[PDB]
């Protein structure tokens, strides 16, 4: 936390998650409980989407949110964009459900059996003890999360190359994509038309390039400690790293909301509905060209608008926490109105 | 505004905000699910 003086600070219940921000074990426990909640939502809602799926209609009109996310990977897709056999969606939903179960079990284990601070441990638990002031352990955690995201990108790459086939909007069948792009100059040139790429080989080439970039960043962050040039320009607290991550996930949400509404192959038009139109009224939303009867919207509209609004409010959360990390009081803005 | 938080938490404004929230959720539940004499 910030703690502009008053080192022994007490937070009330409406800021109740600020109480464990200094301790270590509850800091692990709350986050793995949150990951259990995300895995539970994923598995339980693709099961709920299998429960409320009709094969006599098109996909995106009935609010199909997760089954197009699995059909773009090409798991149970047939011919012409038709889904007749849904075994592996139920398989990955059950996998995510039991994964949420074991993650919640570990969360309650760290809340109950593991102590608050990991400095009282003796074996490997003392090596996992972290503080918001030393950047070395934070760099180790940073590099290992970099390595895990790179491993996830490599798993997606193997799903595109060896472990299965992806889906395209041209042939509307599965496709075993091999021999991707190997040139980084055209990847440097992809900063202008990244929204419409229209080729899956370029997609898996960009994915293996960003995956190898992530592995390089991971081994770089594990190998060298963080330097001194960034410690003079970046703040080192809980709310500072919270702010950097909040701005990162808000930018990622804006990027994903732009990617959802205009793409055609990473979001097929028969699975998510037609591509959208960026329409600014009061706020910039995404409207469909055709109008659904029961005031309804496609999955593309729901995904793009929800991710845009969540990215917007996460940007203001980054703003709140980043101004908090710079020393602002925030009753100073109430004292500025009260002095007036 | 150390007095505006106390004025917005007086009895009439809080009971009007609570009745506005109650009437709001009642009207919304009666729009999306109308005409429920029983269960």
């Amino acid at each position: 936390m910030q703690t502009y003086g008053n080192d022994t600070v007490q937070y009330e219940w409406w800021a109740g998650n600020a109480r464990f921000a200094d301790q270590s074990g509850l800091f692990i426990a709350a986050h793995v409980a949150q990951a259990a909640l995300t895995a539970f939502w994923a598995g339980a809602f693709t099961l709920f989407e299998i429960s409320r799926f009709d094969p006599t209609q098109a996909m995106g009109d009935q609010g199909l949110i997760l089954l197009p996310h699995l059909a773009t990977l090409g798991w149970g897709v047939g011919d012409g964009g038709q889904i007749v056999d849904t075994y592996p969606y139920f398989v990955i939903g059950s996998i995510h459900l039991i994964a949420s179960a074991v993650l919640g079990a570990g969360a309650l284990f760290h809340t109950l059996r593991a102590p608050a601070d990991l400095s009282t441990l003796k074996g490997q638990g003392k090596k996992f003890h972290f503080t918001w002031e030393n950047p070395q352990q934070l760099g180790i955690i940073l590099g290992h999360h970099l390595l895990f995201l790179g491993a996830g990108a490599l798993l997606l790459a193997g799903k595109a190359m060896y472990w299965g086939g992806l889906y395209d909007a041209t042939t509307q069948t599965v496709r075993l994509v091999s021999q991707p792009t190997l040139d980084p100059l055209v990847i440097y040139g992809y900063q202008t038309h990244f929204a419409s790429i229209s080729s899956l080989e370029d997609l898996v080439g960009g994915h293996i390039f960003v995956g190898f970039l992530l592995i390089g960043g991971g081994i770089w962050h594990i190998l060298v400690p963080p330097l001194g040039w960034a410690k003079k320009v970046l703040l080192f607290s809980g709310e500072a790293i919270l702010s950097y991550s909040l701005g990162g996930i808000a930018l990622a949400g804006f990027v994903a909301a732009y990617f959802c509404a205009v793409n055609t192959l990473a979001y097929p038009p028969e699975f998510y509905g037609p591509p959208l139109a960026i329409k600014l009224g009061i706020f910039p939303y995404f409207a469909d060209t055709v109008e659904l009867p029961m005031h309804a919207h496609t999955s593309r509209a729901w995904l793009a608008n929800a991710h845009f609004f969540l990215a917007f409010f996460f940007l203001q959360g980054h703003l709140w926490h980043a101004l908090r990390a710079l020393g602002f009081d925030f009753k100073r803005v109430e004292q500025a109105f009260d002095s007036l | 505004m150390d007095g505006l938080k106390s004025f917005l938490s007086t009895a009439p404004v809080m009971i009007m905000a609570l009745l506005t929230f109650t009437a709001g959720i009642l009207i919304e539940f009666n729009r999306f699910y109308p005409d429920l004499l029983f269960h």
Partner: protein, 139 residues
């Protein structure tokens, strides 16, 4: 019962063809006409409510009944324990005139444990006061 069900009543089938649209949904009268078909009606074509306690008609009475018996108890417990925790701070009069709205929001959220808390307060003796320490009126 002597009342005909709405699935075969002639007056109800004559009146269901022109049920008025209440909301902005133009098919609201038709979906009401098929929703009220499960109920039973008299000789006028209006759905009566069996209230005797039989569970085959519990959806008429008992299913909303206990639903209200949650929410009223919720409001009652939120109104009761809040008064207890403003029995003293420094002065209860201003805390009853202006609301300590974080304390009120805390009770308003935590009020959904009210029936187990009611049996707990009844067993602990802190629910019902004694018949002698209560400020009664003179006879």
């Amino acid at each position: 019962a002597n009342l005909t069900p709405c699935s075969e009543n002639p007056a109800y089938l004559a009146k269901s063809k022109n049920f008025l649209n209440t909301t902005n949904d133009p098919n609201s009268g038709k979906i009401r006409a098929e929703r009220y078909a499960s109920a039973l009606c008299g000789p006028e074509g209006y759905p009566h409510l069996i209230v005797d306690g039989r569970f085959t008609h519990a959806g008429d009475f008992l299913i909303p009944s206990i639903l209200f018996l949650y929410i009223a108890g919720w409001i009652g417990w939120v109104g009761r324990s809040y008064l207890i925790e403003i029995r003293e701070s420094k002065n209860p009069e201003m805390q009853e005139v202006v609301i300590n709205v974080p304390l009120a929001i805390k009770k308003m959220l935590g009020g959904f444990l009210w029936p187990l808390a009611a049996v707990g307060e009844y067993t602990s003796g802190k629910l019902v006061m004694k018949d002698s320490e209560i400020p009664t009126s003179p006879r």
